[model samples]
Target: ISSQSSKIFKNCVIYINGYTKPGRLQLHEMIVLHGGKFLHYLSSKKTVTHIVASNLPLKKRIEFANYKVVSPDWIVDSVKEARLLPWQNYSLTS
Candidate 1:
């Protein structure tokens, strides 16, 4: 069990840069080559959730999964629409 656990831990630490340059296609390729298992895990999902900055340009935000761009006035509406899970939290002090 210890050996198996160690192997899993090592695998988890494998470096995979998903944020590649050029385009999303390149990012996809990196995900496939460096972190195929992680990609598979993500692709198996039927729905993906993401939080976005409302102030971001629409073109860039659209590149990501459907997101409720956060705005000062829409906090409640955004949270309700996103159906955020209980354990999820955010902080702005940084």
Candidate 2:
């Protein structure tokens, strides 16, 4: 078993941007169940710790604010294990 296991982002509030395969509404439900919060909109990157996305805006990566850009897949994977996987595996830019 993995020694490093936790609901790593239980306190995180996320704002999703761009696209998603299973749709954003479904993802929001999961977030609430997992002890997380969801932003109604991405008006600004502020007030959220993460920006879950499958696509980005025309702006350069750096042009956006400082927040972790994770793929929706990351949430699915995290739910599977009840632990936060290394988000690098599901990074929007990686």
lDDT of 2 by residue, 3-48 (tens): 4335456788877777786688887777777777888775554677
lDDT of all the models against the reference? Answer: 0.29, 0.71
Best by TM-score: 2
lDDT of 1: 0.29
Taking the candidates one at a time, how many backbone clashes does each contain? 0, 0
**Span of 10 residues, lowest total lDDT, candidate 2:** 1-10
Candidate 2 wrongly placed segments (more than 4 Å)? 1-8
In terms of lDDT, model 2 sits at 0.71
TM-score of 2: 0.77
Best by lDDT: 2
User: Mind giving the per-residue lDDT tens digits that candidate 1 earns over 67-87?
Assistant: 332222222332334332221
Error of 2 at 55 (Å): 2.4
